[PDB]
Amino acid sequence: KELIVYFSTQSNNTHRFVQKLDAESIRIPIDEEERIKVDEDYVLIVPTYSGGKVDAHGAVPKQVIHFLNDPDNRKHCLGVISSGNTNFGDSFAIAGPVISYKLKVPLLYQFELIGTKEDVEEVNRIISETFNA
Amino acid sequence: NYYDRSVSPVEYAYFDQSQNMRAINWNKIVDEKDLEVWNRVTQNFWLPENIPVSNDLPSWNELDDDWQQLITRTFTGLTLLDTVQSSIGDVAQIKNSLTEQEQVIYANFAFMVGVHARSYGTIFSTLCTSEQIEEAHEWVVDNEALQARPKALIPFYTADDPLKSKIAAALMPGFLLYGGFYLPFYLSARGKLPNTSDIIRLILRDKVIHNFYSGYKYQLKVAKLSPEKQAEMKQFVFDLLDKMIGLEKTYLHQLYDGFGLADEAIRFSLYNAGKFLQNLGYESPFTKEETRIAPEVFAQLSARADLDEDWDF
Ligand SMILES: Cc1cc2c(cc1C)N(C[C@H](O)[C@H](O)[C@H](O)COP(=O)(O)O)c1[nH]c(=O)[nH]c(=O)c1N2
Numbered sequence A: 001k002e003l004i005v006y007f008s009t010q011s012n013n014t015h016r017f018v019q020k021l022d023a024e025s026i027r028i029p030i031d032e033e034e035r036i037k038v039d040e041d042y043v044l045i046v047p048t049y050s051g052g053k054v055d056a057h058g059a060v061p062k063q064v065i066h067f068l069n070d071p072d073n074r075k076h077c078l079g080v081i082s083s084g085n086t087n088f089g090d091s092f093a094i095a096g097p098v099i100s101y102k103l104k105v106p107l108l109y110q111f112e113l114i115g116t117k118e119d120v121e122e123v124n125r126i127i128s129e130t131f132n133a
Numbered sequence B: 001n002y003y004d005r006s007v008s009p010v011e012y013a014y015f016d017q018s019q020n021m022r023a024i025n026w027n028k029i030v031d032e033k034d035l036e037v038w039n040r041v042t043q044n045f046w047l048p049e050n051i052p053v054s055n056d057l058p059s060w061n062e063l064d065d066d067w068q069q070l071i072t073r074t075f076t077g078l079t080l081l082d083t084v085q086s087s088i089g090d091v092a093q094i095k096n097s098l099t100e101q102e103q104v105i106y107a108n109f110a111f112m113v114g115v116h117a118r119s120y121g122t123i124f125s126t127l128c129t130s131e132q133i134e135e136a137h138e139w140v141v142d143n144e145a146l147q148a149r150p151k152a153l154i155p156f157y158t159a160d161d162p163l164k165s166k167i168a169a170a171l172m173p174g175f176l177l178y179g180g181f182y183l184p185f186y187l188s189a190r191g192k193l194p195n196t197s198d199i200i201r202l203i204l205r206d207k208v209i210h211n212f213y214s215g216y217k218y219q220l221k222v223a224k225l226s227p228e229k230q231a232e233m234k235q236f237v238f239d240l241l242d243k244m245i246g247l248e249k250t251y252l253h254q255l256y257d258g259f260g261l262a263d264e265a266i267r268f269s270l271y272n273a274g275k276f277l278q279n280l281g282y283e284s285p286f287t288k289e290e291t292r293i294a295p296e297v298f299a300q301l302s303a304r305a306d307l308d309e310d311w312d313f
């Protein structure tokens, strides 16, 4: 029952990373009028959009907040993987820590853009161990 | 629909005088990603006067004439690349825009890269002598290895292939300055010029979005081309990046000669070369080993490397 729930904007960086992973994935819709219901355990994979302002506001995409706001969706989160770009410095991938704090779940990994070979191999291994232990 | 039977002024000016012009429509937006980027870069507006660089004087005065010269030369070199991108590169992108908002975003990019170039002037005004400033300018003009890099990109901006122009516009903020940006982070890892490093971090907060946006617009255009032409463009990107990596390595070995920073500076460069490729939708072929820099220096870039009322709980 290995499952990913992920968000990706129109740039589809997080989408492309997630499609390189072994586990089945479900996409949180971009459209703010649309919502999804998930009733299985999942690892959450989301990008950061605070924009390096000095400030965790907008760090978690609004669509991800809307998804987690539903307690039926919220309760199934085993852990969060966040992405972004180290050039945002103190704001790098901070969507993960924010979600980790809000849900009281582990921050499992942080990566950049569409991810490397190493990121794919590591996240596959981490998702496996997360659903076992 | 008025939009489908009219052109933007810049389309009219350079490409098609056969149709009447439409005003920009910020109320009906083709691509929400444009509004995303516009809001962030305008909200992130800054000027180098905002940073008290005078507080770097103590750590600056502890550096010998060789290290002070290295910094002035490095930053004058980066000033040149920002002057290229502000005066040619970003403004050249406006007429090749997919959307109306993209035209205005590239005008913001050209202005803010102008602010980047100006910020080095602010540092020099505080720390450097007139002799150090003049010497650095002479050195930049006469350094053929330095000059080779912008000389390789400018032709793509002035030529009539918009995709090659776009790749060049992405490569500048995505790669070409990071060999130089290594130096301030190396120094601030040793508690030297900490306020200068704050200016560099504000510059990177802009350049990361510039590289992303150019790479995003590149991908939207190439996606419409035939599989053959997509393979052709991918070939061109790797061929150009190979050339630019070669020119950058040659320059950095001359810049950092006798300081022993060339090797780490080149690894930081290749790390960013990897991110440039990813921002164009291509896999990075670089090994985590090829791109590794010292943790204490990387920590100066990001310490994380190691709220809205819509929250219902
Ligand atoms: C306007 C804006 C703002 C931000 C970003 C980008 C852009 C365009 N990104 C980088 C972003 O998370 C990264 O490019 C992701 O790979 C994008 O994922 P999707 O393409 O949306 O799946 C980013 N990254 C980060 O580490 N911290 C941040 O605060 C931000 N903020």
Ligand SMILES: [Ca+2]
Pocket (backbone or CB within 6 Å): B047, B048, B049, B118
């Ligand atoms: Ca100013």
Ligand SMILES: [Cu+]
Pocket (backbone or CB within 6 Å): B085, B109, B113, B173, B206, B207, B210, B211
């Ligand atoms: Cu730029």
